[model samples]
Target chain A: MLEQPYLDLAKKVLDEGHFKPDRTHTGTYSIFGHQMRFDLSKGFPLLTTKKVPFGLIKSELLWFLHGDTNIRFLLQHRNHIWDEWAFEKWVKSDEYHGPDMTDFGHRSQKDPEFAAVYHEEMAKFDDRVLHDDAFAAKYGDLGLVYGSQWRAWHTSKGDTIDQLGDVIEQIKTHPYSRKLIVSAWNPEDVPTMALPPCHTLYQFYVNDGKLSLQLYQRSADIFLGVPFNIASYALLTHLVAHECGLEVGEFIHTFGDAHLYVNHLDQIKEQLSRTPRPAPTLQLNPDKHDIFDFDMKDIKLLNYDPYPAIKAPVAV
Target chain B: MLEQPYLDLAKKVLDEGHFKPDRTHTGTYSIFGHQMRFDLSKGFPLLTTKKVPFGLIKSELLWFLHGDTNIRFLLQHRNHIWDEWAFEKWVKSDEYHGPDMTDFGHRSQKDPEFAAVYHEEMAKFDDRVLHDDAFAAKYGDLGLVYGSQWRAWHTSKGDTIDQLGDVIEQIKTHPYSRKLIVSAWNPEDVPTMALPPCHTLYQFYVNDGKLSLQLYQRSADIFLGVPFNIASYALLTHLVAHECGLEVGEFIHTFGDAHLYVNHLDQIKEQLSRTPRPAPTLQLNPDKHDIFDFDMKDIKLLNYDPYPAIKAPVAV
Candidate 1:
C-alpha cells in the first residue's frame, strides 16, 4: 500500500488519459497534472510490485551530487542509464562519421537488425568515453544537465552560482525559510540543450524538526521514469535531512504532464496486477556526513523483496 | 462546498502546521507541501467564504500579460498593490530625502503617526509615477518581477527570450505537448532580486478539448496571498483556453511552503466558520482571442456574492 500511488496513477492514465503523440513515435496515454506523496517515515518507497533497479538510481544521483556532468563517472560505476543522452550528442556532432543513428530510439525498437547495430555503436561510444581522455572531454560532458544546472549555473557576467550548495546551506542556517529552491529550468539553455530537464526544479521544507521536499517535474513518463524519479528524489531528501540533522518527512512529487507510453501500457498493466508488498528500508552511511561526499558503497537498501523486472521500450 | 479545498487547507494549517520564524520576523503556522484543484468547468474559483478582490487580480494579471513591470500601469488602473515595492526603491535612492521610510511595511501598520507620513509619501510617489515620465522611468520599473520573467527572460547573451509567448504558441500548435511551460525561476537573477518569484513556474495541459493549468508556487502567504493567486491563475487559464478554442478544465495549484502568518490566524478562523457560497461565472470579451493584447476591460466577473472582505496585516 506504500507504493499504491504509482499503481493508482498508472490505472488512472489507462482509464482516463488522452492518447497523444509524443517526441517518440510510440504514443502515450497522458494526463496533465498529477501529485503523489511518499512518506519516508514509514519506509523507503521503492516499488515492490515490480522490481525497480536501485543501483542505477544511486549511481545517477551521486553523479549529480558531485556536480560531475561527464558520462565517464556513470560508466565507471556501470550505470548506463544516461548512456543514450550523451551518445546522442556524440552521434550528432561533426567530427565523427558513424552509421545512421538518427531516430535510433524508435528504429532500435522497431527493427531488430538496426537495434543490434545501434547497441554495438553505443558500446563503442561508451568504451571511448571510459578509455580515451581527449574524446571523453569533448563528448562526455553533458553541457547543462542536472549536474551543471544544480551546482554551477552560468550567470550573464560569466560567473557561476552553486544553486544546490547555496540551498543546502540555507536549509542549515535558515531552516524555516521558504525560498529553499533549486531550479534546472533555465530558459536560456533549454532551446539548445540536448534534452531539457524533466525534473525541472525542487524545494525543501523544514517543519517539526523534519525535512520535506517537493519536486516539480515538467514531464513524467509515468511507467519508466516516475519510479526512478521517486526513489532518486526520496534519497536526495534523506541525504539532505541527514546532513541537516533532521528527520525525513514526505516527498511530495508534483507533475506537469504525466503519461504512460503506448508501448509500455501492457507493462504498466502487468505492474498494476501485482499487489505491492511491504516497502523496503534504506540505510545511509553514518560516517559520511556530507551529501556531496556520498558514494554508492555508502548507501544501501534493505529487505527490498520485489516482483520480477518488467521490461519496456525507452522513449528518447 | 464548492471551494472546500481552500477552507480545508486553512483548517489543516491551523490544526496541524508547525510554528516557524520566517525571514520577515513574523512567525507563521506553516506546512511544507500542499495542493488544491479548481475545476474551471464547474465555475470560477473566486473564494466565496470571504470576498476576494477580482478587480485587483484582473488589473495585476493584465499588467503581467502586457509585459508591463512598471507600477505606472498598475497605478493607472487604481491598483495600489504594487505601490510599496516601487516606492521603497524610490525612497532608498539618492533622489529621495523624504521622512524615514525604512521599514515602512511593518512600521506603518503598527504606528498610526508613521503610517500617515508613509501613506503621504507613497501617495506622492504614486502621483509622480503616474504623471512624471522621467521619475516613473527611473523608479517605477520593478525589474525581474513576473512581467519581465514571464514575458522577456534575459538570456546569457544580450537577447531576451519570450517564454510565455513561446509556450502559448506551442499550445496553439501542439496542444498535447508536455513542454508547454512558462518559468520565472531564473537562478541567474535570484540573488540580486528584491523578491524572487513565488508563483515560480506553471505548465499548460490540454486533453478532450479542455485546457488545464498547474502552478508550482515555491512560497505562499496563505491567508493574504493564496486567494489572489488562485483567481489570477484561473483567469489566465480562461484566457489561454479561449485563445486555443478549448473548454475550460481545471487549475491545479501546488505549493512548497504554504503558511499562515501568526497574525492572520484569527481572520482564517473567521473565514473557516462561514459556509462557502456558490461559485461565480467569469465572462471574457468574445472578440478578445489574444491573451497578451487583452486589457482590464475585457474581463468581468458575475454573481460573485460573498461575505465581507477580511483584513490581515501582510508579512513584509
Candidate 2:
C-alpha cells in the first residue's frame, strides 16, 4: 500500500498514456507531469510487489554522500550497478588495451561464448581497480552522475559547492529556510555526461521538528526507475533527519516526463496483479551521527518480505 | 475550461492544505507537490476569471530576454513590478541621504502619512534612474534576478553562461533531449540574491513535432503569484515554439510548496465562483522569427475579457 502511487501511475500510463518515441529504440507510453508521495514515517517504500536491490541503492547513495565520482567505492562494496557506465568509458579509451569487448553490452546476452569472455574481462577490470590505485583514478571515475552534482559541483575542486552537505547544515541552523535546494542540472556539464542527472533537484522543508524532502526529477523510467528512486530518497530523508535530530516526514517524488517503456508493459501488468504487503521498516545505525561516515552495514531493512524480482530489459 | 487545472488545484489546496509558517510572516495553507497543465494549442492561459496585465508581463519578459538586469529598461516601459527591489537597495545605501523611509514596504501599505513621503522619494529615485546614466548604473541593477541567470551566469563575463540561448539552441540541435534544462538556483549566488528564484528550473520537450515546456517552481503564492506565473510561462512556451518552427503543445507547471496566504482566502473563494470566459488567443508578429530579438509589439493577447482585479496584500 505504501508503494501504491507508483503502481497507480504505471497503470495510468499503460492504459491511456500518449505513445511517444523515446531516446532509446524502445518506445514509451508517456505523460508530461506526475507526482508521487511516500510517507517514510508510515513505512519504507521498497516495493513488496517486487524485490528492489537495497544494497545497490545504499552503496550508490553513500557514494554520492561521500562526494565520490569514482566507481571504486561502489565496486568495493560489490555493487556493480554503475559498472557498465564506467566500463563503457574504459572500453572506448586508447589506453584501454584490455580484452576485445567492443560490442560487449549488445553481444553479451546473445553470444554465450562472447558473454563468458566479457565477464572474465570485466572481473579482471574490477580486480585491477581494487588492487591498483592509479588505474582506478583514471578509468573508474563516472564524472558527474548523482555524486558530482550533489557534492563537488562546479569547475574546480577548491571552488566546488557541496550542495548535499550544506543543505544538511541548513537543517541544523535555519530549518524554516525555503531556499534549501540542491540542483544537479548544471548546463556546463550535461553535454559531457553519458547520462544526464534524472534526479535533477531537491528541496527540504521543516515543520514541527519534522523534515520533508521534495525531489524534482526531469525524466523518470516509471516501472524500473521510480520504485528505486522512491526508496532511495526515502532512506535519504531518514538519514538526513537522523543527522539533524529531526523526525522523518514525507518524501515527495515529482516528475517532469514520467513514462512506462513499451517493452516493460507486460512486466508492469504482472506487477500490478500482485498485492503489496506491509512495507518494510528501515533501521539506520543510531550510533552513527553523520551519514558521510557510514559503512555499508549501518543501513538495513527489517522485514522486507516481497515477491521475486520482476525481470525487465532496460532501454539503454 | 482552458485553465480548469489551475482552478482544480486552488480548490484542492483550500479544501485540505497543511497549515504552516512561511519565510515571510504571513501564514499559509500549503501543499507540498502540485501540477497543472495548460494546452497552449487551445488558447493562452491568462486567467479569464481575473484580468491579468499582459503588458507588464510582456515588458518584464522582454527585459529578461534581453539580459538587462537594470530597472531602467523596465522603468522605461512603465513596468513597476521590479521597482520595489531596486528602490529597497538604493534607499538603504550610505550614498543616498533621502527621506526617512524605514521598513518602507511594511509601512507604506499601513501608514498613510509615511506612504506620501515614500511615494515622494520613490518618484525622485525613479526620475534620477531614468535621467542620470551614472546613478542608473549604480542603483538600477538588481544583480541576481532571472535576467542575470538566464543570460550572463556566474562571476566573470568570460566564463559566464547564457542558459536561455544555450537551451534554445539545444531544442534546435538535440530535439529528443531530456537534458534541455535551464537552472537559476546558483548556490553561490543565492545568499546575495534579493529573493531566490521561485521559477527555479525549466525543461523543454519535443514530441510529434510539438514543443512543450515544464517549469519546476520551488514556491507558489496560489492567489496573487500563480495567475501571473501561468501566463508568463505560457507566453514563453509560445515564443520558444515559434522560434523552433514547431506547433504549440502543453505547458506543464510543477510546484514544490504551493500555498495560499491566510488573508487571501476570501478573494480566492470569490475567484472560484466566477465562470471562466473563452481563453485569450496569443498573436505573435509573423515577421519576427527570432524571439531573442523580440520587441513589445511582437507579442499580443487577443479577446482577453475577464472579471475585475481582485485586491490582496502580498506578504513582504
Candidate 3:
C-alpha cells in the first residue's frame, strides 16, 4: 500500500506515455515529469512486488557516503553495480591487455559468445582493481562521480566544498533554513562525463521534529533503476534523520524524464499484476551517528516479503 | 483551464500544509514536495484567478538570457523587482550617504515615516543604477545570480560554462539525450550568497516533435511567486521550441517547499473563491529564431482575462 504511488506511475507511463527513441536506440515509453512520495514513518519503501537487491543499494550508498570514488571499495563489499562504469575506463586504457572490448555492452546483450568474453574481461578487471593499489588509484577511480560531487565540489578557486557536510550542519543549527541542498549535477563536468548524475539534486526539510528529503532526478529507467533509487534515498533519509535526532518523514522522488525501455514492457506489466505486500522497516545502528562512518553492517531491513523477482533485459 | 494546477496547489497548501516557522520569522503553511503541470499547447498559464504582472517576467527572463547580472538592465526597463537586493548592497556599502537603512524592510512596513525614506532611497538607487555606469558596475552588479549561473558557470579551470546555451545546442543535436540540464545552485557560491536560487535546476526534454521543460525549484512562495514562475517557464519553453522548430509541450514545476506565507492567507483565500477565466495565448516573433536576440517587443500575451489583482505582502 505504501508503494502504490510507484505502481501507479508505471501504469500511467505504460498506458499514456510517449513512445520515443532514446540515446541507446532502444525506444522508450516515457513521461516528461512525475513525482512520488513515500512516507518513511510507515515503513521503508523497498517495492513489495519485486525483489530489489538491498545489499547492492547498501554498499553503493555507503561507498558514496565515504567519499570513496574508487571502485575498489565497492568491489571489496561485493557490490558490482559500479563495476561496469569503472571497467569501461580500464578496458579503454593502454594498461588493459584484454579481448577487443569495443562496444562490449551492446555486443554482450546480442551475442552469447561475446557476452562470455566480456564477462571474463570484466572479472579480470575487477580482480586487478581489488588487488593492485597502484592500478586502482589510476584506473578504478571514477573521477567526478557522486562521491566527489557530493563531498568535494571543485570550486573555481582550486578548492573543494563538502556540500553534504554543510547541509548536515545546517540541519542541526538552522533547522528552518530552506537552503539545505546537495547537488550532484556540476555544469562544468556534465558535458565531458560518460553518464552524468541521474539523481541530480536533493534538499532536506525539517518540521515538527521530523526530517524530510526530496530528490530531483533528471532521468530514470523506471523498470531497472527506479526501485533501487527509491530504497536508496529512503535509507539515506532515515540515516540523516537519525543523526539529527529527528523522526523520519517522507522521501519525495521527482523525475524529469522517467522512461520504461521497450524491452522492459512485459516486466513492468508483471509487476503491476502482482499485489504489494506490507513495506519493510529499516533499522539503522544507533551507535553510528555519523553517516560517513556507516558500513553495510550498520543497516538492516526487516519483514521484506515480496513476490519472486521479475527478469528483464537492460537497454545497454 | 490550463492554470488549474496552480490553483490546486494553492488550495492544497492552504488546507493541508504544515504551519511552521521560516527564515524571515514570518511563518508559512508549507508542503514538502509538490508538482504542477501546465500544457503550453493549450494556452499560456498566467493565472486567471488573479492578475499577475507579465512585463516584469518578460524583462527578467530576457535579462537572464543576455547573461546580464547587473541591475542596470532591469532598472532601464523600469523593472524594480530586483531593486531591494541591489538597494541592500548599496546601503551597506561605505560609499552610501543615505539614511541608516538597517532592517529597512521590516521598519518600513511598520512605520510610514521609514517607508517614505526607504522609497526615496530606493528611487535614488534605481536612478543611479540606470544613469551612472561606474556606480552601477560597483553597486548594482549582483554577482553569481541566475544570469551568471545559467550562462557563465565558473569552472575550476578558470573558464565559464554556458549551460543554457549548451542545452539549447543539445536540444538541436541530440534531442533524445537525457542530460539536457542547466543548474543554478553552485555549492561553491550558495553558502556565501545572501539569496541562493529559489528556482534551482531545470531540465529540458524533446520528445515526439514537442519540447517540454521541468524546473526543480528548492523553495517557492506559492501565492506570490508560482504565478509568475508558471508563465515565465512556459514562455521559456515556447521560445526554445520556436528556436528548435518544435511544438511546445508542457512546463512541469516541481518544488521542494511550496509555501503560503502566513500574512497572505486572506489573499490566497480570495484567489480560491474567484472563478478562472479563459487562459491567455502567448505570441513570439516569427522573424526571430534565436532566443537571446529577442527583446520585449518580440513577445506578447494575447487575451489574458483575469480577476482583479489581490495585493499581498512579500516575506522579505
Candidate 4:
C-alpha cells in the first residue's frame, strides 16, 4: 500500500531470486532497493532517499544546463567529490609527463592570460585528451559525452547541433510527431568522446495527450549511480513535457546488469530498512522548457523525508 | 588502421574517463574489441568472435522458431544454459503456486512452461508488485520485459505482436518500409518486469536502399555480455533482412553504463593485447523470413578466429 511495501518486495525478490544460495558472484548480488512511481496528475517525481543536499543536485543540473562539457566548471561549485578519483587517474596516466596544468594556476583566475594559455594548451590536446584515457584523467570531463551529443554532435563534415535544436523546437510546435526522438548514441562519434554516453539515449512518447519517456540505460550502478540517474531523467522528462504542452507520464528506467557493488551492501540494506516517508515533489521553471534554458535556481524540491545518508564506495 | 587501435581507444577511455580510478565494487569494463561495418550486399552480419558452433546456433534458432520460451524443449538438444535461471525462478514463483490449476504447467508444449507460469504469477502480483518489494521479489516479472515486449507486447486487451508481425510481413511484401520500428519499452508494463528492460527498444531505418538497425540498449554489460548482445542482434538483423528480401545494414549498439567490472580487468587487458580478426560471416536459412519460421538448422557461421575465452565473474 505504501512505498515501503514496494521497497520490501524488491528486496525480497532480489534476496530470493537474484541471490542464489550457491552463487559465485556472492558480493555482486542484490536487487533494486528503492522504487518510485509518479503520476503526472500529481506533479514532478523527485526521490527522498536522504535529505539530498539540494545544492549538489542543483549545481550538477546547472552544469548540464550550460551545455558545458568541462569538469573545471563543476570544480568551481565545490563539487570536488568526483575530482580526487579524476586527479588520481591523471597522475598515473600516460599523458602526464609532469605536474597538471591546473596546478600551475592555469585553471585559477589569478591570471587570466595564464588561463587562456592553459585553455589553448588544452585545445591542442583536445582530440587526444577527450579520446585518450591518460589525457582525460588529468582534465576531467564534465558530461562531455552527453553534452556534446546533445548540443554539438559531430559529423563527417561539421557539427549537428542544428538537428538537436530543431527537435526541441518541433516538440513545442508539433508534439504529436513520432520524430520527437533525441539520441545521444552516435556510433560514428563514440570514438571521440571522453567517455561513451551512459543513459545513452531517450525517446519521448505521447499518448492520449500525455508525454512519457523511456530511457535506454545500457548499464546501471544500482547503488551509487541509479539515484542520480532517476533524478536526471526525471528532470529531463519534466523539461520535455513542459515544453511539449503535455502532462508528464512516466520515467521508465530500463537497466542491463543492474548490480550493486560488493561494498554497497550495508548502505543498500540500510536504505531498504528505512521507511520511505513520501515521494518528494519537484518544482520546475514552467516558462523555460527549452532543454538548455533550465538552471539550478529554477528548480526546487518540497517535502522530502528519509533516513540519514548512508555512504558507499563508488565502483569504477 | 586496425581494430586493435579502436579497441584500445575504447579501453583507454573507459579505464580513465568512465571508471572512477579508486573504488571497490564488482565493476566490469570492456572495449569494443572489434567492430565491423558490414554491407548487406556482402551478406548477413554476424560477429566472428570465436568459432561459434554452427550446430548449436542453428538448433537455438530452431528453438526460437517454435516460439518456445521454456528451456525443457531446448534441454533435449543439450541446451541447458538458459534453463538454470528460468527454472530457478519458476520454482519459487507465485504463479507456479497459484490456487487454480490453470496457472500451473506449460501453457503449450512448444512454449516454455516456466515462462507461462512466470507470466501468470506476474499477472497475479501486478498490483502489489508495482508498489510492493516482496511481491515483486516472489513474482514481479512476466519475462516479457524484453522477450514478450519485443515479439508479443500486450496492448489494451489486445496483442501488439501483430504490429511487429505486420512490419515483418510488410518488409517481405514491400522490402522498403525504411520506417520498420520495434519497441520493447512499454511504459504501462515497466512495473511488471523482473528487471526493467535495458535493451529498451530498437528501430530499423532504410535510406538509399540499405537496411540499418539502431538499438537503444538502456543498459550494457561491457565485458561478458556485450559480445553476446552484438552477436544476437546482428543475428536478428540477418534474420529480419532475409525475411524481408533485403540485405543486412549496419548494427549500432548504444549504452548507458557501459562499464568494465573490477573483476574483469585482467581479461580486458588480455583481450586488448590480442589483435582482432576480420569480421566473420553469418549464414542463415535462405527461404525462411517469417521471424518465427526459422529453425536452428537454418543458421551457420564460418571463419571466426580470436584469442582464447577469458573467464570473468558475471555481476548477477
Which number leads on DockQ?
3
Work out the TM-score per prediction: 0.97, 0.95, 0.98, 0.45
User: lDDT of each prediction vs. the true structure?
Assistant: 0.87, 0.85, 0.88, 0.53
Per-residue lDDT, model 2, residue B104, is 69
Root-mean-square deviation per candidate: 1.7, 2.1, 1.3, 22.7
Candidate 1 lDDT over B1-316, as tens digits, reads 6689988888888888888887776788888778889998888999998988898999999899999899999989899988877888898888888787666777666677778877788888999989999999989999889998988999778899889888888888888777778899888878777888889899898877888999999888889899999999999999989887789999999988888898887888888888888899999989878888898788889999999989777764
For chain B alone, what TM-score does every candidate structure achieve against the true structure? 0.97, 0.96, 0.98, 0.70
DockQ-best of 2 and 3: 3
Return the clash pairs for model 2, or none: none
Kindly report which residue stretches of model 1 are placed more than 4 angstroms away from their true locations once superposed.
none
Reference contacts preserved by each model: 0.83, 0.50, 0.91, 0.02
Candidate 2 chain A: minimum summed lDDT over ten consecutive residues — where? A102-111
* DockQ for candidate 1, C-alpha atoms: 0.79
lDDT string for model 3 (B262-283, tens) is 9998888888898789998889
True contacts kept of 4: 0.02
TM-score of 2: 0.95
Question: After TM-score superposition, what is the CA distance of residue A115 in candidate 4 from its true location, in Å?
Answer: 27
Of candidates 4 and 1, the better by DockQ: 1
Measured against the true chain A, the candidates' chain A TM-scores are 0.97, 0.94, 0.98, 0.71
Q: Please give the DockQ score of every candidate, comma-separated.
A: 0.79, 0.53, 0.85, 0.03
Off by over 4 Å in 3: none
